[PDB]
């Protein structure tokens, strides 16, 4: 048993190196398909996966030759635990292959969607990224908005109903083979905490009132713009008017809903263009930010192998921005169809946060080369993006000119941040509440579409621009739903990124609550080695410890908390509550009529 724990350590040392290498090969094939969708690359990705799944199955089986639960070392027990978790790889060989073909079908459908120009039904090569997204973010013609919404959702959503259904059945069977109740519990296992769901319910209910105030004010402002025929006072907001295809963030309509329209509203897109920014510049600036904090510089493989602009050769590819770890040394990459905008600048930093995490933990053993939990991975880049979005940072890099930071410009910037950060929370909760409710069997197949729009109404108070029914199937019109990417990570990120940002700001000397000149919402952590250090301590851990331990490394705390995100927005809350009362703004909404059962 002592003898045995010593051999086990050697077994792990060696098997970890082998999984890195086999995964490397699967990652390269996935990369090739995602950057160039073809039948041939599909076949290749899916065959290499099939093979890696088969080997994982043998590894799981050989775990039972070791008395690992009897061992002394927490660390060895943790690695063995992690090797027992097969996920889809637990499926019979044939079911696994079917599942991969189902996943390919959906993701490739999403990526190849094209629609006809509203103004020209002969031009039929408009893609979400960038053509349809540009209209949704910029047009204030409600009818054009509605048209693109229907065209998109009909092709990206409804077209893959039968595929989505088989995926739920196979996902459910895979979870049961791992002895989880459903896919919901399989995802939740990543957070290592039996009360996790409850914890988020608690946090969500504490911020909901702020969301409802924001919702109410936006609805008021949209009525003055579009008039009462297009937006009602008491009903859900028509989602097509909120500047995003899924209404997940509303910051693209800030110019019509901002508190003080005569005071400055930060939008540096136009200046980025005026100064000749490219994608390459944007990523080099993101690099600069990380190295400024004494973190690790992008390696050369990054620059040689990343794809940072949409190919011009008319190939099909997944443009949904992503970051990739190849599981060797220093081979990390981003695939981003980058455009020169303010919000793409933030995305660049978002993505490079994943890359940094990968570089920070690449000396760990294979099974620890992932986030402390999924939410940690998503948060890293957003802590930087927070800084980058500040007027402070933006004047430093010359993108924001002639800005005066009076009380009214502060409220504008606060609100603008809230349109991305508070608004998102209900949206993000719903993506997984929906999927969970299907995975767990709580909704009947006859009710699957209206169950989606029900959640969206109940939690976000938004609805489709047109009537939908069980003849439509709208959920897979969101990337992550079509691609089988758990979404809760993003809700977790949006809470915990404030815990990290506040703590990083304190460490940098950029925030003191008792000093009016260092308010949280204008903290820049650029150049702070103090913040950098705290990051290094947490990120270098990988998944070597449960996530509270990784948090504790960063700032000493162990609990996921809503206190920070509220502390950030508290000045907005005060003002906004008062402004809604001042203007007699109706808060809340009636039940949507847009989904017919
Ligand atoms: C998900 O949960 C599943 C249960 O719902 C679970 O499946 C069970 O896993 C067991 C593996 O631990 C497996 O156990 C073996 O059962 C054999 C009996 O088989 C049939 O008879 C049953 C009873 O009447 C029927 O109901 C079943 O359908 C079966 O088909 C036994 O032969 C076998 O035994 C040997 O194995 C143990 C090994 O155990 C340990 O090893 C060390 C030594 O190496 C021991 O010292 C240690 O203390 C411990 O015992 C030996 O003790 C023994 O001498 C033999 O070598 C074994 O018990 C069980 O059949 C299976 N049941 C069911 C209902 O499926 C899945 O494993 C779970 N999945 C995941 C992913 O976790
Ligand atoms: C895309 O993949 C195919 C294989 O199906 C290959 O022959 C083709 O030339 C690739 N395109 C690019 C631009 O890499
Ligand atoms: C930066 O990190 C190094 C290790 O890479 C460390 O020894 C040093 O203290 C840090 N430097 C700064 C600027 O704090
Ligand atoms: Zn991300």
Numbering used by the authors: 18 to 614
Sentences reproduced from the published study:
Here, we present the use of the Drosophila melanogaster ACE homologue, AnCE (which, in particular, shares enzymatic properties with cACE), as a model to study the structural basis of ACE inhibition. The active site is located at the centre of this channel, marked by the location of the catalytic zinc ion, which is coordinated by His367, His371, and Glu395. The high-resolution crystal structures of AnCE in complex with the dipeptides VW, IW, YW, RW, and WR presented here reveal dual binding in both the non-prime (dipeptide-1) and prime (dipeptide-2) subsites of AnCE.
In YW-2, the tyrosine side chain forms hydrophobic contacts with Ala338 and Thr364 and a H-bond with Thr364. Interestingly, YW-2 folds in a conformation that allows for a π-stacking interaction between the tyrosine and tryptophan of the dipeptide. The additional difference map density around the tyrosine side chain in the S1′ subsite resulted in alternative conformations of the side chain to be tested, as well as dual conformations with the whole dipeptide flipped. This ambiguity could be caused by lower affinity binding displayed by the dipeptide (Ki: 0.75 mM), which, in turn, could be caused by Thr364, though forming a H-bond, it could also have a repelling effect on the aromatic ring. The YW dipeptide shows low affinity for AnCE, with a Ki value of 750 µM (0.75 mM). This effect would also be present in nACE but not in cACE, which has a valine instead. The substitution to Phe512 in cACE could influence the binding of YW-1, as this would remove the possibility of the H-bond within this region, and instead be replaced with potential hydrophobic interactions.
